[PDB]
């Protein structure tokens, strides 16, 4: 492992290389200017970005002495050995040659004083401080640290002379991810039809080890598609097939469609399968959503050419059972950006100040794996109007909405995050949310009309055997006031009658008959009420 | 143990078997493809599922060294000792030969490093992270984990290189396979049918089946040794297994009287999707899920739900209306989410929500803290019943006595599509016959006369009359005679008034007209 293994962080790599190499390769410059170089690095960032890999690279390349210290491995049973261990380690490091020290998980042996108990922790922290910067502090020794939670470190350790340059090794961009993919696939034998440039673009939040996992999974799938076809050959491996190995593009696509970024492993959404053809009617809304979603991500050069950021938020409102969550499902299924589904009251908590910690966590997750689609379902619950309630519920339900206000439009770096809202009482959300910059465009999704409802029926029966002489237009012209869910129910009842007939006969009937479908239509429902549809109509008119 | 001692977890067992053994059987393949194999597995599922059994079986089938580490065992109060214990364990595992490390219950020693306050927990977490990944971390040795809640683990631990693979180890055929493999070493009997066992024990994790078989076998000898060639003709029968099960309701399509069309509709709509998944896949459509019952109280809605739940191999989770509300902020919604997560975690399952008038309440607007709580509960219920879910197999069944106070978002098709109305002397005859199934009857009593004098009673009233007759019979003893019915008939209640009947009739007429 050398400096070429690590890719995607050329800036940070150079930032570390300068102080690790130039003082040891060309020290004439610093004596000519008469300033000693910085001596201390704190690599931070999300887990797996390549901090330990960068330490390994700088260790294997430089000819200087390298000493490894792990975090919890320094302290021992008896009182006064953690400090003795640190003393011996630093003495050995400085005894012989210019040396590099590397502390894995410095957060495990550098807790913030004034908030931790146990005297041994304080004593070892103080010993580390004295070793790194005290009287006769150091003599040509460099220290490197690696952590995932820099804020949980003693501020006395994050000072010049101890940790002066804190390099941020974070998630790569598209070019960095492309570089990571190309480096990881240098020894694995692939197929000529595999293109790395396209494959890197679909991945958005995959950082380092995530990409490695993708590669490994693809190879495993390729092994399991054809190894099973051939004899196991436990005695020996046939040479002819070994030269036939490779990885095809379909393997990479399959492995990609299963994997998710390691950051968003806890919030993984179940594999629900919907497609744009499965949503009938409301084509203009479909095209508008596609425009507002996939123009920012597929054509960012245009937006910077015009020098403007894109619009982000959308809110569907309308009568229940029309395709709001269905549109959310379709977006989640056939869009490159990551999806984080959240239910309405799912984020609220028993304790004080935890619903806001939950909101903070999910929105930081969204900003880390940008571009991302955050689908807030039933916004009418958490986004209640502030107004006046005079109660602890009012106090807690007012604090939660205020966190949402500052998270969507606050002090953030304009990262790509598209918020989709879905409510059924749009009059009961504070106007501070129904504003451009939070949810700019408010899409009303009425009940389907004759053409739209007919298209819905055609979409619903995509994979249903039907008689050649069936005329769905007639049932569509004799329906009024229905919703897509009601037509779905009609389809379900027709299928159930067909199944009843098939079981009674028991392929006696390889299709749904017009008689079965008429029997199903006999018990029409008309889910939504006309007494209550006027509320939506008045709200839209206003 | 061996691979033959595992049943039901076929696909995940095969996946773990191949991912562990392919490197061991021949590394030339991975050398040729030039990629290193996965070296970590996070098993998660309810306790007693067979996860450690699977790990042990894989370790036994291969030339490995199964080393077990318990969660609470390694954690200690001394400073710098638990980390030393983990380091010693890993050094031992890597020292001898390529081995399998099974660290059980990592959730006890992985508190996410933010919600914890003890420094030893964070220190051991960091030690685990350094051991799994780092400079020369692992050299041909794999680690297996186990937990009930996989969420309460460090994100750094659920990374690639530490726990790159997560396996869900949660049915009828697997349960039957476990029954077959757990009774392989004992000659039970010739007339014992395992279909009833695989259908009746519909809520057994898999480690409880071994206990059930052992208990039945022990009780067979316990009952066959009071008086005592003896070794000949030994083994368990159906009676021993039934007793073991006795040591989750007892109804089968008989305790309900009348309402034949309602019974047939429920039976069809519940059994069709369970018996014939192939037909629906051929037709390419999902089944209906929701049913709502409304009418006067004490009519048998709970009885009907139990009677339609019993014939299938599904579970039964009955929850009362106000039996979930709490004074805290977000506890009711947490309870609802837990209930539905349990319901969909064991498919198939029928959930019986009782007194929807208490939960739904037609949220609208109330302008109060109770109003906000009701709004949040209604929204959570709406999202869970039909939202960003998979709806594998869940049959929500509602039951209320005031459907007018329900919002038109739960009555919507796809959530509670079927609006069934539950409303006679001929029906009362069947009700009395079903109630008096196992009872010593007199030839001289005429149930027709008893039913003729009801004129608007409910099944609760009939059960009360039967209970009074039984009390009189027991008083006389300390068969049922006619004079007990004669004296018990005068003390009728007729708790259901007349105005509510008019309200129900008006609601039914409005629904029919709609």
């Amino acid at each position: 492992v050398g400096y070429d293994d690590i890719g995607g962080c050329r800036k940070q790599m150079a930032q570390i290389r300068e102080m690790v190499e130039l003082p040891l390769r060309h020290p004439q410059l610093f004596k000519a200017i008469g300033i000693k170089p910085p001596r201390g690095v704190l690599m931070y960032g999300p887990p797996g970005t390549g901090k330990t890999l960068m330490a390994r690279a700088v260790a294997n390349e430089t000819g200087a002495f390298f000493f490894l210290i792990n975090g919890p491995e320094v302290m021992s049973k008896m009182a006064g050995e953690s400090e003795s261990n640190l003393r011996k380690a630093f003495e050995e490091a400085e005894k012989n040659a210019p040396a590099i020290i590397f502390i894995d998980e410095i957060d495990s042996i550098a807790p913030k004083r004034d908030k931790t108990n146990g005297e041994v922790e304080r004593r070892v922290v103080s010993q580390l401080l004295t070793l790194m910067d005290g009287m006769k502090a150091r003599s040509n020794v460099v220290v490197i640290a690696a952590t995932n939670r820099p804020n949980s470190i003693d501020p006395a350790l994050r000072r010049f002379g101890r940790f002066d340059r804190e390099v941020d090794i974070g998630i790569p961009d598209a070019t960095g991810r492309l570089e990571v993919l190309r480096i990881h696939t240098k020894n694995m034998k692939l197929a000529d039809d595999v293109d790395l440039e396209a494959l890197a673009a679909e991945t958005h939040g995959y950082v380092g080890a995530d990409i490695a996992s993708l590669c490994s999974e693809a190879a495993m799938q390729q092994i399991r598609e054809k190894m099973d076809l051939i004899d196991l050959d436990e005695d020996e491996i046939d040479a002819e097939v070994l030269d036939s190995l490779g990885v095809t593009m379909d393997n990479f696509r399959f492995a990609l469609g299963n994997s998710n970024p390691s950051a968003l492993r806890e919030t993984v959404v179940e594999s629900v399968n919907v497609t744009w053809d499965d949503v009938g009617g409301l084509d203009e809304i479909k095209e508008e959503l596609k425009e507002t979603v996939e123009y920012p991500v597929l054509h960012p050069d245009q937006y910077t050419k015009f020098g403007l950021s894109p619009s982000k938020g959308v809110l569907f409102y309308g009568p229940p059972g029309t395709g709001k969550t269905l549109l959310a499902k379709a977006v989640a299924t056939e869009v490159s950006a990551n999806f984080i589904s959240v239910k309405g009251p799912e984020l609220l908590s028993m304790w004080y100040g935890e619903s806001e910690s939950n909101i903070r966590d999910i929105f930081d997750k969204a900003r880390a794996a940008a571009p991302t689609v955050v689908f807030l379902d039933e916004l009418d619950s958490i986004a209640k109007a502030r107004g006046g309630s005079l109660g602890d519920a009012g106090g807690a339900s007012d604090r939660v909405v205020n966190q949402l206000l500052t998270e969507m439009d606050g002090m953030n770096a304009k990262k790509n995050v598209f918020v989709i809202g879905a409510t059924n009482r749009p009059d009961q959300i504070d106007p501070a949310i129904l504003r451009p910059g939070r949810l700019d465009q408010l899409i009303y999704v009425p009940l389907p009309d004759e053409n739209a409802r007919l298209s819905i029926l055609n979409a619903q029966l995509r994979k249903t055997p039907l008689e050649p002489g069936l005329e769905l237009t007639a049932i569509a012209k004799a329906t009024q006031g229905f919703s897509g869910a009601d037509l779905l129910y009609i389809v379900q009842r027709a299928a159930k009658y067909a199944i009843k007939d098939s079981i009674e006969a028991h392929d006696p009937v390889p299709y749904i008959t017009k008689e079965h479908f008429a029997e199903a239509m006999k018990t029409a429902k008309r889910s939504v009420s006309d007494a209550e549809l006027r509320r939506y109509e008045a709200y839209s008119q206003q | 143990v061996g691979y033959d001692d595992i049943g039901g977890c076929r696909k995940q067992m095969a996946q773990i078997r191949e991912m562990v053994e392919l490197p061991l059987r021949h590394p030339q393949l991975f050398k040729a493809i030039g990629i290193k194999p996965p070296r970590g597995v996070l098993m998660y599922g309810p306790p007693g599922t067979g996860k450690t059994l699977m790990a042990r079986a894989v370790a036994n089938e291969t030339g490995a060294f199964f080393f077990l580490i318990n969660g609470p065992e390694v954690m200690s109060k001394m400073a710098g000792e638990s980390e030393s214990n983990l380091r010693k364990a890993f050094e031992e595992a890597e020292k001898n030969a390529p081995a399998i490390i099974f660290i059980d219950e990592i959730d006890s020693i992985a508190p996410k490093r933010d919600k914890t306050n003890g420094e030893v927990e964070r220190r051991v977490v960091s030690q685990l992270l350094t051991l799994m990944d780092g400079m020369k971390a692992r050299s041909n040795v794999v680690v297996i984990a186990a937990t009930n809640r996989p969420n309460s683990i460090d994100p750094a631990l659920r990374r690639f290189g530490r726990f790159d693979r997560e396996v869900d180890i949660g049915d009828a055929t697997g349960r039957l396979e476990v029954l077959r493999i757990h009774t392989k070493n004992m000659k039970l009997a010739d007339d014992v049918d395992l279909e009833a066992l695989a259908a009746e024990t519909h809520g057994y994790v898999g480690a409880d089946i071994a206990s059930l078989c052992s208990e039945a076998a022990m009780q067979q000898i316990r009952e066959k040794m009071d008086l005592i060639e003896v070794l000949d003709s030994l083994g368990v029968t159906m009676d021993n297994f039934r007793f073991a099960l006795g040591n989750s309701v007892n109804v089968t399509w008989d305790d309900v009287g009348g309402l034949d069309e309602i019974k047939e509709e429920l039976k069809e709509t519940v059994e069709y999707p369970v018996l014939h998944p192939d037909q629906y896949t051929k037709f390419g459509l999902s089944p209906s899920k929701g049913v709502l019952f409304y009418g006067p109280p004490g009519t048998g809605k709970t009885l009907l739900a139990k009677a339609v739940a019993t014939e299938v191999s599904a579970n039964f989770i009955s929850v009362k209306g106000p039996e979930l509300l709490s004074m805290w902020y977000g506890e009711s919604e947490s309870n609802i989410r837990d209930i539905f997560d349990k319901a969909r975690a064991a498919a198939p399952t029928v959930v019986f929500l009782d007194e929807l008038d208490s939960i739904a309440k037609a949220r609208g607007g109330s302008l109060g803290d109770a109003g906000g709580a009701s709004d949040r509960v209604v929204n959570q219920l709406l999202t869970e019943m039909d939202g960003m879910n998979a709806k594998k197999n869940v049959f929500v069944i509602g039951a209320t006595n005031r459907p007018d106070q329900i919002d038109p978002a739960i009555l919507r098709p796809g959530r509670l599509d079927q609006l069934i109305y539950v409303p006679d002397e001929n029906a009362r005859l069947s009700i009395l016959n079903a109630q008096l199934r196992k009872t010593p009857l007199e030839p001289g009593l005429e149930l027709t006369a008893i039913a003729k004098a009801t004129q608007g009673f409910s099944g609760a009233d009939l059960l009360y009359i039967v209970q009074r007759a039984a009390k009189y019979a027991i008083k006389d003893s300390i068969y049922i005679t006619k004079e007990h019915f004669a004296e018990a008939m005068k003390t009728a209640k007729r708790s259901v008034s007349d105005a509510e009947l008019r309200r129900y009739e008006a609601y039914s007429q409005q629904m029919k007209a709609s």
């Binding site: 009182a79 807690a396 | 803290d369």
Partner: peptide
């Protein structure tokens, strides 16, 4: 001759949390 040694590892503390009531 024998010798002694001192050791002081840690202790156990108790925290207090705040809850929110929705009436």
């Amino acid at each position: 001759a024998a010798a002694a040694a001192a050791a002081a590892a840690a202790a156990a503390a108790v925290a207090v949390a705040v809850a929110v009531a929705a009436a």
